[PDB]
Amino acid sequence: RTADLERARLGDDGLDFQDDAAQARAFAQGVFLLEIPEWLDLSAGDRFARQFFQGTGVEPYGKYRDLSSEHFGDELLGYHSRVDQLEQFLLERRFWGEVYPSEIATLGEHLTLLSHRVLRSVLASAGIPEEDWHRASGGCSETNGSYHLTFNHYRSAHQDIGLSSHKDDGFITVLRTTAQGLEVNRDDVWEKVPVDPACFVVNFGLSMEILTSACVTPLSAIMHRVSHQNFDRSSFGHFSSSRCLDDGIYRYLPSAGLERVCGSRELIE
Numbered sequence: 589r590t591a592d593l594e595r596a597r598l599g600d601d602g603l604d605f606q607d608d609a610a611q612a613r614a615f616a617q618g619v620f621l622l623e624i625p626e627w628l629d630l631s632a633g634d635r636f637a638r639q640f641f642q643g644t645g646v647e648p649y650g651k652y653r654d655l656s657s658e659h660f661g662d663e664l665l666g667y668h669s670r671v672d673q674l675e676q677f678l679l680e681r682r683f684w685g686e687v688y689p690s691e692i693a694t695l696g697e698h699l700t701l702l703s704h705r706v707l708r709s710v711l712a713s714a715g716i717p718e719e720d721w722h723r724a725s726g727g728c729s730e731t732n733g734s735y736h737l738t739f740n741h742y743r744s745a746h747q748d749i750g751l752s753s754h755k756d757d758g759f760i761t762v763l764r765t766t767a768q769g770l771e772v773n774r775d776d777v778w779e780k781v782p783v784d785p786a787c788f789v790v791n792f793g794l795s796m797e798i799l800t801s802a803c804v805t806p807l808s809a810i811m812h813r814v815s816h817q818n819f820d821r822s823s824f825g826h827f828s829s830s831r832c833l834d835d836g837i838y839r840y841l842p843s844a845g846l847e848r849v850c851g852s853r854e855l856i857e
């Protein structure tokens with residue numbers, strides 16, 4: 589009912605789990621906890637997630653409610669009401685400096701570099717040659733990927749599930765949640781992700797699963813969901829996926845290199 593997750597920290601040689609066994613369990617479960625660097629201020633992000641949906645009467649972030657999909661050439665960005673309790677504000681990195689408040693873009697840039705370090709520690713453990721990392725990761729092994737900083741609010745007045753079962757797109761998700769609600773289908777039972785506001789929740793997406801399907805330890809994009817909320821809940825996440833402006837989505841074939849599977853666009857769909 590409550591999942592037991594391995595905990596890691598970012599140190600000098602990438603991810604430091606307690607030992608090599610723990611790291612292998614974590615990567616194999618597809619979800620683990622990552623301690624939040626003590627210098628990293630998350631308070632502006634927390635407030636944005638509590639406010640973005642409220643409209644221009646609420647300062648300083650309520651006005652972002654009015655930036656809907658039409659203000660962007662990209663269908664998927666801005667404020668969106670979902671079918672579940674969730675509503676969201678989503679923005680890819682190319683737009684952070686112009687659109688987000690400056691302190692929110694800063695948070696996004698910190699998360700991007702933190703996510704980059706986590707991703708490289710994961711690629712090394714998969715036995716992929718370093719010179720293939722950039723193309724395998726669609727740029728995320730450097731700072732060339734696509735990055736979404738996404739803010740979530742669950743409308744407890746809506747009778748739906750919070751957010752229905754899904755696997756993330758992309759390579760790596762760093763999730764900041766401070767309230768009960770997240771659930772993962774680790775083995776075959778649904779389990780609650782325990783609350784720990786001093787850690788992020790890290791999991792992988794479909795592009796990571798595709799990439800590593802033929803490795804020694806294939807990595808899985810874990811199915812997860814948010815249960816029906818009786819009171820409001822908010823959260824936010826940093827999502828890394830392939831740059832899509834490159835082209836392809838790849839699978840690594842040991843001893844041979846990268847095989848193109850599909851495109852950036854058709855995978856999101």
Ligand SMILES: O=C(O)CCC(=O)C(=O)O
Nearest residue numbers: 740756765770814823825
């Ligand atoms: O709000 C959460 O805790 C989960 C959000 C999530 O899984 C997503 O945005 O894809």
Ligand SMILES: [Fe+2]
Nearest residue numbers: 754755756812
């Ligand atoms: Fe998700």
